[PDB]
């Protein structure tokens, strides 16, 4: 099925790889070559996750836990029942996420859109790749990755934080948190403003960009304007993921002590040492 | 009975059916393979008298 | 869409194929039961 | 005296019923444009059925 | 005295009055069973030791 | 709602029913008193 | 004295008075059951030892 | 609401019903006083 | 008295009446089976020592 | 809804049905009373 | 909206439903009270 | 939107179906009570 | 009183009323279900003399 | 009474009703199944006097 | 005094009033239900002399 | 908006409803005070 | 009752019914398979006298 | 009396009545088997020690 | 919609007949059950 | 949409499929019951 | 003095005043209810000679 | 906005409302003082 | 609101009702004094 205006947009062309070969739709979905590789990796990864659940102690969704190998295996593939399965699933994940971003690029090219969406998603892929590839590689063992399990990965997050005694004191983490919180505030204001001009109280005329601009300017003192708020929301949301990648990659590979004692440089500035 | 295919496009039903049957079969095989009694890759050569059985209620 | 004649023709394949699949599955359960009964 | 049922669990299912209600409402709002869908078997509505297309009153003059 | 019914719907009255009487009767029996020790004496007459 | 003619006629049944109900209840209380006096 | 009724609806009058009477009577009876030890003496008269 | 004419009929019944309520209540109290004097 | 039925759909009347009876009769039988110790005495006749 | 002609005719069967029901229950209670008298 | 006629007849059902609901609730409370009093 | 005669035809199905459902649920409680009373 | 239905759409009010009653009933039921005195699913059969009661003593 | 179906569309009310009854039934069944007294899948074969009962008022 | 309603839309006043009264009623009931003396669900059957009381100024 | 004479009519209902509510609440406090006085 | 198919498109109702029944069946099977008494893939061969039963109320 | 059936379809009537009788009869049999110790006495005749 | 007056007339006669037969057979069954295992 | 004769026709299959389904479920429950009763 | 209502719209000032009085009253009740001497929901029935008093100068 | 005589009418109610509030508060304070003095 | 003519009638009844209430209360106090003197 198609939207009432959709058919004239369903042209050939805009692919990166494969040409006409996969240039077709399946229901709502665009396929393409990277659609085919997406489904391959998604399917292989998901079934290996189900296999991980089957050989683990429970089918309880919250408790399934496919763990990485012991650190002793270093950068090798471990035995599959001893964490090698987590490694194969990680390759499927990297393939699925990369295929998704390239399929987004093919869709955007077909619609004559800018490449903003694929690159914005690249921010999230960077954080995932930091957690399971880059940081474990810098530490010299794949066993530093997080386990695949809805709550067991939260146990990993807890323990990694307390490896540095007081992870709130990590300076890149403070920035990352500030971006996440500021993003959520900005999203609530942008949503509210557009809705409040487009859905005014009954019997009021539809609002305008001028009213939105005036109100916003009483909130922050300055006008952000229409393109400015979308630049800001993109800067905040993607910057949050980039600073997250920074805050975790410096924890271990570069800083090994507790995070509170990193702040010793501030106490010893020569003006007040 | 055949008028069901006037109501539904058979070309769509066969997609839905194959999808459903594929997932269902994978579910049932993985459920059995996770069991103790039917973990046939490790224990399939055991005779039915030798295969695991879950715990009884104790009598008292 | 389909003609009712085309619906009859497809229904013939569809019922036959469905029952054939159920027949193969019933034999698979006969073999599985013979090897390791579940009741 | 219910051992398993506790207030945190009761609250959590209260939220789930609201949240699944909210997703339905949002998916009704998402269909005010482009629906009903075109199909070789005629129009399709998806589920839930969409809310009707809005008409917007313009500022009378200025 | 009949003029009070004027303007009403006779089904509405019979619904209201019927509702009240079922409620009143049920309450009066639940109360009466507590006070009069009946059917408790009935049950004790036929109870097995 | 009811005109006066409906009300005048309705009232005769309503009064009769109310009287009948009280008559039955008066028997019920006479029997109940005979069975287990409450004062 | 009847001119107090003029602005009113007689069904609101009987509704309000009826609600007051139901309320006051129930309050009075439940209070009176506390002070007079009836039906507690009735219950004790037929209670099984 | 009501005319004075409607009000004057309604007042007649309202007084009558109030008076009747007091009369029945007076008998109820006389019986109650005979049974359990409260002063 | 028959004039009370005028506004009504007789199928609604029979549905409401029949449903009331099914409810009332089931309550009365549970209650009676408890008070009268039957079928409990019936079950005690035909039982295996 | 029902006309008066229907309502008058419906009323006759509704009364007849009710009296049948009360009669059957009267026999039921007479049998029950002879079997296990509850007062 | 609706006329004052419509509003006033709607109000009749609204009051009647409310009364019916309070009646069922009152019986429910007296059942609950006789089962396990809260004062 | 419905005409009033359509609403009236729907209403009788809706009432009957509700009362039918409540009747089935009444038997379900009769069975559940017989197996394991909650009071 | 019926002017209330002229001020507010009964269609809007009825949803709010049913919403209020449904929430209020669910709140009260689960509050009682969470209590000791009224946890009727587990203890509904106890009878009023042996149903739990909250601690008395202001002192002694 | 029937004029309610002019104020509300019966197509919406009937789906709202089905959804409400579905949710309510599942809530009551899962609340019971989580209890001790009515965990019928584990303990349904117990007789009424053998079934669990919540603890009485304390006695001293 | 009635000219106050020329300033304020009564249609808004009733909503604000009901909102205020509902929140106030709920607050006071939960304040009491949190107390020791008025936890009526658990201890409502105690007589007035047996209900809890707060600590007096010390003299022992 | 609202007219002078509407505002007056509304006021009479509003005053009656406010004082009616305070009377019910007064009786609620009288009952509460009889059950467990707070001073 | 066939005019329910004029209120609702049967093509849509059947997809919703097939969806509902599939989810419900899987839920009930997974509830039973999680239980002890009906863990049939492990203990299906046990006799009805041997299958687990949840504990009774302790005798006084 | 036949007029109660007017405006009803015979098939909905027989569907509902047949559904009722199937339900009622199964309830009565399962109930009766519990009281009368049958088929339990039949089973005990042919059972193996 | 539904039975006319005369369809209802035909239906009722069979409906009465079926009910009577069912009650008759059930009466026989209860006499056999009573003589086999009396319940009062 | 459907014509009412199509609605009438479709219902007959729908009822029969629902019956056939309930029958298979009834056998499934009685097999399960005789294997391992839940009451 | 009345000219203050020409400078300030009374439909604003009335709402501001009612809000101010509501929050002030709520604060003072909350301060008292939190205190030892005036926690009237628990200790209201104590006589004035029995109510808590805060300390003293330790003047030997 | 108000006229000066419209304002001067409002001022009369405002002063009376304020005096009434202060009177109620005074009686409340005197009750509270007699119950538990703060000086 | 109430005219000068209406006010004149209303006053006479208000005075009558007040005096009646004071008379009844005078009897109440005389009875109370004879039952339990308070000075
Ligand atoms: C954690 C907190 C935050 C968590 C935050 C999570 C937010 C999730 C929001 C998005 C969820 C909805 C996605 C969606 O709408 O997809 C379109 C699809 C179809 O409708 P349509 O698009 O309007 O119409 C097209 C269709 O009618 C015809 O299209 P076509 O002929 O071309 O293609 C064939 C059909 C076949 O239909 C399907 O395959 C539908 C299968 C949908 C399964 C997934 C449901 C997930 C529900 C999640 C909510 C919740 C469920 C409990 O159409 C299609 O192929 C459409 C493919 C759509 C693929 C969507 C995949 C989304 C997966 C999301 C997974 C999320 C996991 C969290 O919609 C549906 O099928 C129905 C969805 C109804 C909304 C969900 C409401 C659930 C409320 C609770 C249950 C209500 C029971 C009555
Ligand atoms: C539990 C945590 C609580 C924790 C406590 C949390 C409390 C939070 C409260 C937040 C309430 C926000 C409400 C709101 O913003 O409304 C918009 C309006 C601004 O809009 P406007 O257009 O400029 O307003 C002026 C006017 O044009 C509005 O007209 P409208 O037609 O829209 O109607 C709105 C009015 C309706 O009118 C009235 O209610 C006044 C009627 C006066 C009648 C006087 C009696 C005379 C007749 C006698 C018979 C009369 C028979 C009745 O309603 C409103 O919307 C506001 C209602 C009052 C809000 C009170 C807020 C306090 C609530 C406390 C709740 C405590 C808990 C139960 O502004 C306000 O209402 C201001 C709210 C009051 C703020 C006061 C400043 C706080 C200072 C605190 C200092 C404390 C230390 C000294
Ligand atoms: C248009 C048809 C009417 C109707 C007309 C009648 C008539 C006529 C009779 C009953 C009778 C009864 N009805 Mg009714 N009844 C209706 C709807 C209901 C509903 C409901 C949820 O809507 C319920 C719970 C009941 C309940 C009851 C029982 C109390 C009783 C017999 C069992 C029965 O009906 O089983 C559930 C079955 C159904 C709901 C199907 C419809 C009714 C069936 C077809 C009645 C057949 C038996 C009847 C005795 C045959 C008549 C000839 C006899 C020789 C006298 N009816 C519909 C709306 N009902 C009988 C009675 O009063 O016994 C004391 C009776 O004579
Ligand atoms: C234990 O402690 C506590 C609880 C405290 C103890 C105290 C308890 C107390 C205080 C109890 C008080 C009880 C009470 C009063 O006060 C109780 C009052 C009861 C009353 C009023 C009963 C009235 C019954 C009336 C009936 C049945 C009428 C039936 C009429 C019928 C069938 C006719 C139908 C047809 C009509 C009408 C019209 C046809 C014509 C039409 C349509 C036309 O012509 O158009
Ligand atoms: C704990 O101890 C504490 C509690 C502290 C102790 C203290 C308790 C106190 C202080 C109690 C005070 C109680 C009290 C007073 O003060 C109680 C007052 C009681 C009163 C007033 C009762 C009045 C009853 C009136 C009745 C029943 C009227 C019936 C009228 C009828 C039926 C006719 C209706 C109208 C018709 C027919 C006309 C139609 C229209 C027509 C014709 C037309 O329109 O034309
Ligand atoms: C933990 O303990 C805590 C919780 C803290 C303790 C405290 C609790 C508190 C504070 C509780 C407060 C409760 C409360 C306060 O007021 C509760 C208020 C309850 C109320 C008012 C209930 C009202 C119910 C009314 C009903 C059901 C009406 C039904 C009407 C029906 C069915 C008819 C509809 C119309 C029809 C059919 C006609 C259409 C015609 C049309 C369209 C036409 O004719 O045109
Ligand atoms: C254990 O404890 C508890 C549970 C408490 C104990 C139990 C207690 C209770 C209270 C039980 C109640 C039971 C009960 C009632 O009360 C039971 C009532 C039973 C009834 C009503 C049985 C009726 C059966 C009727 C039958 C079989 C009719 C068959 C008709 C046929 C075949 C003809 C079909 C139509 C034709 C041929 C015409 C077509 C013509 C057409 C179309 C044309 O002409 O156009
Ligand atoms: C915690 O609690 C827990 C543990 C979970 C426990 C509690 C569980 C609960 C609450 C369960 C509730 C269950 C339930 C409640 O209602 C269940 C209700 C179930 C229902 C209604 C099932 C109905 C099934 C119907 C079927 C299968 C019909 C099939 C029809 C077919 C095949 C024919 C199709 C038509 C054809 C072929 C003709 C085309 C012609 C055309 C087009 C033409 O002619 O044009
Ligand atoms: C930490 O310290 C802690 C511990 C907290 C301790 C310290 C506490 C402190 C510092 C407290 C300070 C308190 C204070 C300071 O000022 C307190 C000041 C309080 C004041 C001013 C109260 C005033 C109340 C006035 C009221 C209620 C008026 C009502 C008016 C009414 C009803 C009439 C409305 C108009 C009408 C009807 C006419 C319409 C006509 C119209 C429209 C027309 O005619 O047109
Ligand atoms: C314990 O310690 C502390 C508490 C400290 C101790 C101290 C306590 C103190 C200080 C108490 C003071 C009490 C007091 C005063 O001082 C109390 C004052 C009481 C008074 C005044 C009572 C008055 C009652 C009046 C009544 C009942 C009137 C009824 C009128 C009726 C029926 C007629 C209605 C109108 C009509 C017919 C006209 C319509 C015509 C119209 C419209 C037309 O004609 O147009
Ligand atoms: C809507 C219709 C169905 C509603 C079903 C919901 C329950 C309604 C119950 C109302 C009647 C209660 O009836 C009450 O049942 C109990 C069940 O323990 C009987 O109790 C008695 O008999 C039962 C029989 O098994 C014994 O186990 C029990 O020890 C004994 O006390 C009471 O003597 C009877 O008074
Ligand atoms: C255990 C199950 C108990 C019964 C379950 C409930 C369903 C009973 C259905 C069979 C009994 C007859 O049920 C009755 O059917 C008729 C049509 O046939 C419906 O009648 C409906 O359609 C007819 C026209 O056909 C209209 O005139 C009528 O106003 C409308 O309500 C009734 O609303 C319903 O009460």
PDB file of N, CA, C and O and ligand atoms in Angstrom, chain I residues 9 11-12 15, chain L residues 8-17 19-21 23-24, chain Q residues 3, chain R residues 6-9 12-14 16-17 19-20, chain S residues 1-2, ligand 12:
ATOM      1  N   UNK I   9     -39.610  -2.264  24.206  1.00  0.00           N
ATOM      2  CA  UNK I   9     -39.362  -3.427  23.353  1.00  0.00           C
ATOM      3  C   UNK I   9     -39.553  -4.698  24.173  1.00  0.00           C
ATOM      4  O   UNK I   9     -38.825  -4.905  25.150  1.00  0.00           O
ATOM      5  N   UNK I  11     -38.661  -7.709  23.708  1.00  0.00           N
ATOM      6  CA  UNK I  11     -37.461  -8.539  23.789  1.00  0.00           C
ATOM      7  C   UNK I  11     -36.504  -8.042  24.863  1.00  0.00           C
ATOM      8  O   UNK I  11     -35.861  -8.846  25.546  1.00  0.00           O
ATOM      9  N   UNK I  12     -36.396  -6.726  25.033  1.00  0.00           N
ATOM     10  CA  UNK I  12     -35.625  -6.191  26.151  1.00  0.00           C
ATOM     11  C   UNK I  12     -36.252  -6.608  27.474  1.00  0.00           C
ATOM     12  O   UNK I  12     -35.554  -7.021  28.406  1.00  0.00           O
ATOM     13  N   UNK I  15     -35.510 -10.225  28.016  1.00  0.00           N
ATOM     14  CA  UNK I  15     -34.090 -10.409  28.297  1.00  0.00           C
ATOM     15  C   UNK I  15     -33.737  -9.975  29.714  1.00  0.00           C
ATOM     16  O   UNK I  15     -32.998 -10.673  30.417  1.00  0.00           O
TER      17      UNK I  15
ATOM     18  N   UNK L   8     -32.360   2.569  17.871  1.00  0.00           N
ATOM     19  CA  UNK L   8     -33.273   1.717  18.624  1.00  0.00           C
ATOM     20  C   UNK L   8     -33.065   0.239  18.312  1.00  0.00           C
ATOM     21  O   UNK L   8     -33.137  -0.602  19.215  1.00  0.00           O
ATOM     22  N   UNK L   9     -32.812  -0.106  17.048  1.00  0.00           N
ATOM     23  CA  UNK L   9     -32.514  -1.498  16.718  1.00  0.00           C
ATOM     24  C   UNK L   9     -31.181  -1.943  17.309  1.00  0.00           C
ATOM     25  O   UNK L   9     -31.061  -3.071  17.799  1.00  0.00           O
ATOM     26  N   UNK L  10     -30.168  -1.079  17.264  1.00  0.00           N
ATOM     27  CA  UNK L  10     -28.882  -1.408  17.872  1.00  0.00           C
ATOM     28  C   UNK L  10     -29.012  -1.591  19.378  1.00  0.00           C
ATOM     29  O   UNK L  10     -28.451  -2.530  19.952  1.00  0.00           O
ATOM     30  N   UNK L  11     -29.737  -0.684  20.036  1.00  0.00           N
ATOM     31  CA  UNK L  11     -29.891  -0.727  21.487  1.00  0.00           C
ATOM     32  C   UNK L  11     -30.381  -2.080  21.983  1.00  0.00           C
ATOM     33  O   UNK L  11     -29.883  -2.592  22.991  1.00  0.00           O
ATOM     34  N   UNK L  12     -31.352  -2.680  21.296  1.00  0.00           N
ATOM     35  CA  UNK L  12     -31.871  -3.956  21.755  1.00  0.00           C
ATOM     36  C   UNK L  12     -30.896  -5.109  21.620  1.00  0.00           C
ATOM     37  O   UNK L  12     -30.877  -6.004  22.467  1.00  0.00           O
ATOM     38  N   UNK L  13     -30.073  -5.108  20.572  1.00  0.00           N
ATOM     39  CA  UNK L  13     -28.970  -6.064  20.498  1.00  0.00           C
ATOM     40  C   UNK L  13     -27.946  -5.823  21.600  1.00  0.00           C
ATOM     41  O   UNK L  13     -27.509  -6.760  22.276  1.00  0.00           O
ATOM     42  N   UNK L  14     -27.544  -4.567  21.781  1.00  0.00           N
ATOM     43  CA  UNK L  14     -26.560  -4.207  22.798  1.00  0.00           C
ATOM     44  C   UNK L  14     -27.015  -4.577  24.209  1.00  0.00           C
ATOM     45  O   UNK L  14     -26.236  -5.126  24.995  1.00  0.00           O
ATOM     46  N   UNK L  15     -28.270  -4.286  24.553  1.00  0.00           N
ATOM     47  CA  UNK L  15     -28.795  -4.702  25.853  1.00  0.00           C
ATOM     48  C   UNK L  15     -28.820  -6.221  25.975  1.00  0.00           C
ATOM     49  O   UNK L  15     -28.354  -6.785  26.970  1.00  0.00           O
ATOM     50  N   UNK L  16     -29.366  -6.907  24.969  1.00  0.00           N
ATOM     51  CA  UNK L  16     -29.461  -8.363  25.037  1.00  0.00           C
ATOM     52  C   UNK L  16     -28.085  -9.006  25.143  1.00  0.00           C
ATOM     53  O   UNK L  16     -27.890  -9.949  25.918  1.00  0.00           O
ATOM     54  N   UNK L  17     -27.122  -8.517  24.363  1.00  0.00           N
ATOM     55  CA  UNK L  17     -25.777  -9.064  24.423  1.00  0.00           C
ATOM     56  C   UNK L  17     -25.094  -8.816  25.755  1.00  0.00           C
ATOM     57  O   UNK L  17     -24.366  -9.675  26.256  1.00  0.00           O
ATOM     58  N   UNK L  19     -26.695  -8.433  28.728  1.00  0.00           N
ATOM     59  CA  UNK L  19     -27.347  -9.317  29.689  1.00  0.00           C
ATOM     60  C   UNK L  19     -26.978 -10.776  29.458  1.00  0.00           C
ATOM     61  O   UNK L  19     -26.852 -11.549  30.413  1.00  0.00           O
ATOM     62  N   UNK L  20     -26.809 -11.174  28.197  1.00  0.00           N
ATOM     63  CA  UNK L  20     -26.321 -12.513  27.909  1.00  0.00           C
ATOM     64  C   UNK L  20     -24.938 -12.765  28.473  1.00  0.00           C
ATOM     65  O   UNK L  20     -24.675 -13.803  29.082  1.00  0.00           O
ATOM     66  N   UNK L  21     -24.036 -11.807  28.273  1.00  0.00           N
ATOM     67  CA  UNK L  21     -22.689 -11.890  28.823  1.00  0.00           C
ATOM     68  C   UNK L  21     -22.703 -11.972  30.346  1.00  0.00           C
ATOM     69  O   UNK L  21     -22.010 -12.804  30.940  1.00  0.00           O
ATOM     70  N   UNK L  23     -25.108 -13.063  32.191  1.00  0.00           N
ATOM     71  CA  UNK L  23     -25.624 -14.383  32.554  1.00  0.00           C
ATOM     72  C   UNK L  23     -24.534 -15.448  32.494  1.00  0.00           C
ATOM     73  O   UNK L  23     -24.401 -16.262  33.413  1.00  0.00           O
ATOM     74  N   UNK L  24     -23.744 -15.474  31.418  1.00  0.00           N
ATOM     75  CA  UNK L  24     -22.633 -16.423  31.348  1.00  0.00           C
ATOM     76  C   UNK L  24     -21.642 -16.196  32.484  1.00  0.00           C
ATOM     77  O   UNK L  24     -21.194 -17.146  33.133  1.00  0.00           O
TER      78      UNK L  24
ATOM     79  N   UNK Q   3     -25.528  -8.651  10.452  1.00  0.00           N
ATOM     80  CA  UNK Q   3     -25.275  -7.235  10.207  1.00  0.00           C
ATOM     81  C   UNK Q   3     -24.142  -6.659  11.047  1.00  0.00           C
ATOM     82  O   UNK Q   3     -23.823  -5.477  10.880  1.00  0.00           O
TER      83      UNK Q   3
ATOM     84  N   UNK R   6     -42.148 -12.966  16.767  1.00  0.00           N
ATOM     85  CA  UNK R   6     -42.170 -12.019  15.658  1.00  0.00           C
ATOM     86  C   UNK R   6     -41.011 -11.035  15.754  1.00  0.00           C
ATOM     87  O   UNK R   6     -40.693 -10.523  16.830  1.00  0.00           O
ATOM     88  N   UNK R   7     -40.389 -10.758  14.608  1.00  0.00           N
ATOM     89  CA  UNK R   7     -39.186  -9.954  14.560  1.00  0.00           C
ATOM     90  C   UNK R   7     -37.915 -10.653  14.990  1.00  0.00           C
ATOM     91  O   UNK R   7     -36.887  -9.987  15.153  1.00  0.00           O
ATOM     92  N   UNK R   8     -37.948 -11.971  15.176  1.00  0.00           N
ATOM     93  CA  UNK R   8     -36.754 -12.766  15.418  1.00  0.00           C
ATOM     94  C   UNK R   8     -36.562 -13.781  14.299  1.00  0.00           C
ATOM     95  O   UNK R   8     -37.525 -14.230  13.672  1.00  0.00           O
ATOM     96  N   UNK R   9     -35.299 -14.121  14.042  1.00  0.00           N
ATOM     97  CA  UNK R   9     -34.896 -15.151  13.089  1.00  0.00           C
ATOM     98  C   UNK R   9     -34.914 -16.507  13.791  1.00  0.00           C
ATOM     99  O   UNK R   9     -34.389 -16.623  14.902  1.00  0.00           O
ATOM    100  N   UNK R  12     -31.186 -17.690  14.920  1.00  0.00           N
ATOM    101  CA  UNK R  12     -30.593 -17.142  16.139  1.00  0.00           C
ATOM    102  C   UNK R  12     -31.253 -17.741  17.377  1.00  0.00           C
ATOM    103  O   UNK R  12     -30.587 -17.988  18.389  1.00  0.00           O
ATOM    104  N   UNK R  13     -32.566 -17.980  17.323  1.00  0.00           N
ATOM    105  CA  UNK R  13     -33.265 -18.574  18.462  1.00  0.00           C
ATOM    106  C   UNK R  13     -32.727 -19.969  18.756  1.00  0.00           C
ATOM    107  O   UNK R  13     -32.318 -20.271  19.883  1.00  0.00           O
ATOM    108  N   UNK R  14     -32.710 -20.838  17.745  1.00  0.00           N
ATOM    109  CA  UNK R  14     -32.228 -22.202  17.941  1.00  0.00           C
ATOM    110  C   UNK R  14     -30.735 -22.255  18.247  1.00  0.00           C
ATOM    111  O   UNK R  14     -30.287 -23.151  18.968  1.00  0.00           O
ATOM    112  N   UNK R  16     -29.062 -19.934  20.049  1.00  0.00           N
ATOM    113  CA  UNK R  16     -28.995 -19.593  21.468  1.00  0.00           C
ATOM    114  C   UNK R  16     -29.556 -20.699  22.358  1.00  0.00           C
ATOM    115  O   UNK R  16     -28.922 -21.089  23.345  1.00  0.00           O
ATOM    116  N   UNK R  17     -30.744 -21.215  22.033  1.00  0.00           N
ATOM    117  CA  UNK R  17     -31.319 -22.294  22.833  1.00  0.00           C
ATOM    118  C   UNK R  17     -30.442 -23.541  22.830  1.00  0.00           C
ATOM    119  O   UNK R  17     -30.228 -24.157  23.880  1.00  0.00           O
ATOM    120  N   UNK R  19     -27.194 -23.694  22.278  1.00  0.00           N
ATOM    121  CA  UNK R  19     -26.039 -23.331  23.094  1.00  0.00           C
ATOM    122  C   UNK R  19     -26.345 -23.401  24.586  1.00  0.00           C
ATOM    123  O   UNK R  19     -25.530 -23.903  25.367  1.00  0.00           O
ATOM    124  N   UNK R  20     -27.512 -22.906  25.003  1.00  0.00           N
ATOM    125  CA  UNK R  20     -27.919 -23.026  26.402  1.00  0.00           C
ATOM    126  C   UNK R  20     -28.035 -24.478  26.847  1.00  0.00           C
ATOM    127  O   UNK R  20     -27.514 -24.857  27.900  1.00  0.00           O
TER     128      UNK R  20
ATOM    129  N   UNK S   1     -37.860  -7.365   8.751  1.00  0.00           N
ATOM    130  CA  UNK S   1     -36.893  -8.213   9.424  1.00  0.00           C
ATOM    131  C   UNK S   1     -37.513  -9.197  10.398  1.00  0.00           C
ATOM    132  O   UNK S   1     -38.383  -8.835  11.189  1.00  0.00           O
ATOM    133  N   UNK S   2     -37.045 -10.444  10.347  1.00  0.00           N
ATOM    134  CA  UNK S   2     -37.522 -11.490  11.228  1.00  0.00           C
ATOM    135  C   UNK S   2     -38.872 -12.069  10.837  1.00  0.00           C
ATOM    136  O   UNK S   2     -39.521 -11.659   9.874  1.00  0.00           O
TER     137      UNK S   2
HETATM  138  C1  LIG X  12     -26.682 -18.324  27.378  1.00  0.00           C
HETATM  139  C2  LIG X  12     -27.145 -17.388  26.313  1.00  0.00           C
HETATM  140  C3  LIG X  12     -28.310 -16.563  26.748  1.00  0.00           C
HETATM  141  C4  LIG X  12     -28.891 -15.737  25.621  1.00  0.00           C
HETATM  142  C5  LIG X  12     -27.836 -14.829  25.064  1.00  0.00           C
HETATM  143  C6  LIG X  12     -28.325 -13.544  24.444  1.00  0.00           C
HETATM  144  C7  LIG X  12     -28.737 -13.711  22.995  1.00  0.00           C
HETATM  145  C8  LIG X  12     -30.111 -14.288  22.814  1.00  0.00           C
HETATM  146  C9  LIG X  12     -30.489 -14.360  21.365  1.00  0.00           C
HETATM  147  C10 LIG X  12     -31.701 -15.241  21.159  1.00  0.00           C
HETATM  148  C11 LIG X  12     -32.920 -14.660  21.804  1.00  0.00           C
HETATM  149  C12 LIG X  12     -33.625 -13.539  21.082  1.00  0.00           C
HETATM  150  O1  LIG X  12     -32.893 -12.357  21.277  1.00  0.00           O
HETATM  151  C13 LIG X  12     -33.430 -11.275  20.636  1.00  0.00           C
HETATM  152  O2  LIG X  12     -33.067 -11.351  19.269  1.00  0.00           O
HETATM  153  C14 LIG X  12     -33.758 -10.358  18.559  1.00  0.00           C
HETATM  154  C15 LIG X  12     -33.724 -10.668  17.087  1.00  0.00           C
HETATM  155  O3  LIG X  12     -33.642 -12.026  16.978  1.00  0.00           O
HETATM  156  C16 LIG X  12     -33.211  -8.954  18.894  1.00  0.00           C
HETATM  157  O4  LIG X  12     -34.054  -8.015  18.275  1.00  0.00           O
HETATM  158  C17 LIG X  12     -33.453  -6.967  17.598  1.00  0.00           C
HETATM  159  O5  LIG X  12     -33.778  -7.029  16.242  1.00  0.00           O
HETATM  160  C18 LIG X  12     -35.157  -6.932  15.975  1.00  0.00           C
HETATM  161  C19 LIG X  12     -35.417  -7.101  14.483  1.00  0.00           C
HETATM  162  O6  LIG X  12     -34.900  -8.295  14.045  1.00  0.00           O
HETATM  163  C20 LIG X  12     -35.761  -5.605  16.468  1.00  0.00           C
HETATM  164  O7  LIG X  12     -37.124  -5.614  16.268  1.00  0.00           O
HETATM  165  C21 LIG X  12     -35.435  -5.464  17.972  1.00  0.00           C
HETATM  166  O8  LIG X  12     -35.901  -4.291  18.506  1.00  0.00           O
HETATM  167  C22 LIG X  12     -33.925  -5.634  18.202  1.00  0.00           C
HETATM  168  O9  LIG X  12     -33.627  -5.653  19.539  1.00  0.00           O
HETATM  169  C23 LIG X  12     -33.360  -8.753  20.408  1.00  0.00           C
HETATM  170  O10 LIG X  12     -32.681  -7.633  20.778  1.00  0.00           O
HETATM  171  C24 LIG X  12     -32.856  -9.974  21.216  1.00  0.00           C
HETATM  172  O11 LIG X  12     -33.304  -9.843  22.501  1.00  0.00           O
END
